[PDB]
Amino acid sequence: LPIHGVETPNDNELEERFSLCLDEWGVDIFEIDRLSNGHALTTVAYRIFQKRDLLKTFCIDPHVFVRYLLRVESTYHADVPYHNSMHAADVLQTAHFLLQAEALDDVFSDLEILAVLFAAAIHDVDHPGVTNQFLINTGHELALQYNDASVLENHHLYMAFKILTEKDCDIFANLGGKKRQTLRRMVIELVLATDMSKHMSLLADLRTMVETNLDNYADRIQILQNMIHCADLSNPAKPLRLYRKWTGRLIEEFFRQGDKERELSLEISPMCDRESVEVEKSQVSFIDFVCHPLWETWCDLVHPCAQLILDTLEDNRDWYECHI
Amino acid sequence: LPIHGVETPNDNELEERFSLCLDEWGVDIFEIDRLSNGHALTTVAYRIFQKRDLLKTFCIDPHVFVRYLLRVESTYHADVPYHNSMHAADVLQTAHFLLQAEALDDVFSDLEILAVLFAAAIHDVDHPGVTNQFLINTGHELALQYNDASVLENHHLYMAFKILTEKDCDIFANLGGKKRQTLRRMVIELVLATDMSKHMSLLADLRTMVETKKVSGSGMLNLDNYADRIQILQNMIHCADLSNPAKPLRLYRKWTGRLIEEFFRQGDKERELSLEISPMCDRESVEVEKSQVSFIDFVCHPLWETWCDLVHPCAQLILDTLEDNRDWYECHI
Ligand SMILES: Nc1ncnc2c1ncn2[C@@H]1O[C@H](COP(=O)(O)O)[C@@H](O)[C@H]1O
Ligand SMILES: Nc1ncnc2c1ncn2[C@@H]1O[C@@H]2COP(=O)(O)O[C@H]2[C@H]1O
Ligand SMILES: [Mg+2]
Ligand SMILES: [Mg+2]
Ligand SMILES: [Zn+2]
Ligand SMILES: [Zn+2]
Numbered sequence: 023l024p025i026h027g028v029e030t031p032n033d034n035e036l037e038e039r040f041s042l043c044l045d046e047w048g049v050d051i052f053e054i055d056r057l058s059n060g061h062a063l064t065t066v067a068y069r070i071f072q073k074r075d076l077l078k079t080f081c082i083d084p085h086v087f088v089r090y091l092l093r094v095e096s097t098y099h100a101d102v103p104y105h106n107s108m109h110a111a112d113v114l115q116t117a118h119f120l121l122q123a124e125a126l127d128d129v130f131s132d133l134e135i136l137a138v139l140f141a142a143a144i145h146d147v148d149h150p151g152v153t154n155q156f157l158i159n160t161g162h163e164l165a166l167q168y169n170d171a172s173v174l175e176n177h178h179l180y181m182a183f184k185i186l187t188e189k190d191c192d193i194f195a196n197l198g199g200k201k202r203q204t205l206r207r208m209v210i211e212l213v214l215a216t217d218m219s220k221h222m223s224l225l226a227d228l229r230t231m232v233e234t235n236l237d238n239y240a241d242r243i244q245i246l247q248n249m250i251h252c253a254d255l256s257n258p259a260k261p262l263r264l265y266r267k268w269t270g271r272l273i274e275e276f277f278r279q280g281d282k283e284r285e286l287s288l289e290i291s292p293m294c295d296r297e298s299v300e301v302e303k304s305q306v307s308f309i310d311f312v313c314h315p316l317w318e319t320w321c322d323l324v325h326p327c328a329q330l331i332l333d334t335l336e337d338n339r340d341w342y343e344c345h346i
Numbered sequence: 347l348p349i350h351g352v353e354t355p356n357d358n359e360l361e362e363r364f365s366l367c368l369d370e371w372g373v374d375i376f377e378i379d380r381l382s383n384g385h386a387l388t389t390v391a392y393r394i395f396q397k398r399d400l401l402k403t404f405c406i407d408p409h410v411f412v413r414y415l416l417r418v419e420s421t422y423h424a425d426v427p428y429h430n431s432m433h434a435a436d437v438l439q440t441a442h443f444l445l446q447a448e449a450l451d452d453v454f455s456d457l458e459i460l461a462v463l464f465a466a467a468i469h470d471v472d473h474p475g476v477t478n479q480f481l482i483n484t485g486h487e488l489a490l491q492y493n494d495a496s497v498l499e500n501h502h503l504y505m506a507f508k509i510l511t512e513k514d515c516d517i518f519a520n521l522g523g524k525k526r527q528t529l530r531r532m533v534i535e536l537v538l539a540t541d542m543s544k545h546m547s548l549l550a551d552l553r554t555m556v557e558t559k560k561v562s563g564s565g566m567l568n569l570d571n572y573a574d575r576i577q578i579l580q581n582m583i584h585c586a587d588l589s590n591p592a593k594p595l596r597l598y599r600k601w602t603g604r605l606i607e608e609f610f611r612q613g614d615k616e617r618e619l620s621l622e623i624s625p626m627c628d629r630e631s632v633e634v635e636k637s638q639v640s641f642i643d644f645v646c647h648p649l650w651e652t653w654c655d656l657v658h659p660c661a662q663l664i665l666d667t668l669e670d671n672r673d674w675y676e677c678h679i
Binding site for chain 1 (some may be wrong): 485490491492493494495500503504507508530534
């Protein structure tokens with residue numbers, strides 16, 4: 023069993039970086055992926071899970087863990103610039119980080135921590151590099167199949183759970199039936215919370231909660247839904263170099279989508295037009311209307327355990343306002 | 347085009363029955379299926395869409411309608427005892443009856459009426475004879491695909507909108523874009539409201555609207571809002587689906603013999619897979635009569651009572667027949 027779960031060409035350099043970076047906000051996942059040779063998701067997940075004793079706690083065989091994580095990782099599409107396994111690993115680590123706020127100390131069961139971190143790692147698996155709305159305007163097969171509701175998010179979940187079915191990949195094989203049913207329902211609810219069409223409702227829920235303690239599932243689970251959705255939308259609150267990197271990729275993906283939407287004669291989807299999308303304006307607008315309202319609330323929830331996040335978010339917002 | 351959409355051996359019998367029965371509570375859908383050579387769904391739908399002027403209003407070509415309906419009808423499985431095209435024709439006619447209550451006069455737009463009646467016709471298409479819970483308990487493919495959520499209801503929808511693809515089957519071809527898309531959303535919301543795990547939630551919405559009507563004082567409820575209206579239609583198609591126990595006893599009993607056959611087949615499969623046998627699915631343990639009284643006390647009667655309270659006094663006959671049927675089964679224990 024190697025130190026990082028799967029063998030890499032740079033075990034000592036990755037170990038140094040993991041020991042300094044895994045509990046920090048602002049991890050260079052791109053470099054982890056280069057040093058691990060395509061294995062940021064696999065190595066990040068493995069070491070998060072050991073650090074939180076989750077393999078021991080849930081009797082997960084560490085070989086079975088690595089084998090499953092390698093399958094999921096190779097199910098993300100390398101040739102998709104943003105929605106690949108690097109994005110998954112970033113989301114995973116940012117979720118791991120979010121959980122450590124003092125204000126949330128001693129609150130979540132282990133099973134709930136297991137759920138949210140598993141969700142993060144799988145939440146974009148097999149993404150094809152187009153949006154839900156594009157699936158729906160082309161009448162793509164998955165859009166028809168899911169009746170327009172959460173088309174990708176549903177697909178991500180389906181793929182993740184079909185992989186658990188493969189010979190010697192069943193990482194939850196040693197939970198009881200009751201813990202496996204409650205785990206499955208939690209994972210479903212969590213990855214579904216990554217669907218943008220839920221953003222308004224989850225955030226009204228979080229605002230309501232802050233405007234008041236939590237030992238009802240109902241509240242905890244609403245906090246974990248907001249949390250994974252925060253991690254997913256963390257990029258603009260990351261150090262600027264990392265924000266810009268993630269952004270260049272997202273836009274390259276969107277623009278590529280705009281070309282199939284242009285080279286099939288349709289109403290080019292939003293921010294997807296190479297010709298006349300204002301990239302710096304487009305980010306300022308995403309912050310003001312989407313990302314800032316979310317992070318402000320989250321940060322209000324965990325007062326003051328996440329002040330840095332809200333500070334960098336505000337700086338990158340101003341930086342872009344200037345470079346338009 | 348033949349008088350009833352498809353040709354039948356018994357046009358004049360059917361004419362007579364459709365002329366007298368289709369605005370009544372409790373229509374003998376089995377006999378209409380026998381008389382039309384297995385086309386109850388197609389002939390009932392054609393005839394209701396005629397009586398509502400829905401072909402004319404939405405510019406639906408009658409040959410296109412008939413073609414689409416035959417395909418839907420075919421895609422119900424005739425070997426499933428209960429969830430076949432006869433169940434669909436029952437649900438469709440019953441939803442048609444329920445829209446007539448005087449307390450609903452002019453509440454709904456034509457496109458809403460179009461939606462709920464289309465929905466009813468498709469709402470169980472391709473049903474394989476086993477529940478959601480079974481597909482989830484077996485991790486069947488559908489259940490994995492849909493993440494345990496309204497599994498069949500989602501598949502019924504998928505199959506119905508695909509058939510609309512097919513060459514010369516797009517009944518909604520002449521609606522505008524903003525219309526096909528508002529229709530599509532409504533139809534989805536309406537077939538999803540037939541998933542039983544929505545029952546409690548839907549019935550609480552309906553309770554809210556009843557209490558909201560009783561306190562209004564023009565005793566009329568404000569329904570300018572689409573989202574209130576859709577709640578009512580959701581409850582209504584769900585009522586229609588669960589209308590069997592409030593149907594004339596003879597009919598309720600026939601529907602029920604079919605439903606128990608399907609249930610018992612599923613518990614056989616469960617047994618064979620060494621799995622928990624679902625409620626009402628065990629031929630070795632189930633007591634049919636007791637189970638009906640229980641389903642009526644706990645699910646059916648609270649739903650209908652609330653529906654009847656909303657449209658009071660327009661659906662009195664329904665609650666009465668439901669209570670007499672309850673009491674008949676109690677005495678046969
Ligand atoms: N930097 C950004 N600018 C604009 N939209 C973003 C950005 N980051 C995330 N999003 C949005 O958030 C969604 C997150 O879900 P996913 O793309 O499946 O990871 C995206 O598809 C976009 O709608
Ligand atoms: N007579 C009955 N007894 C028990 N359950 C019923 C009865 N009639 C309808 N149902 C239930 O109501 C459901 C409605 O959904 P279907 O038409 O898909 O399958 C059905 C069963 O849960
Ligand atoms: Mg996603
Ligand atoms: Mg059904
Ligand atoms: Zn994502
Ligand atoms: Zn039904």
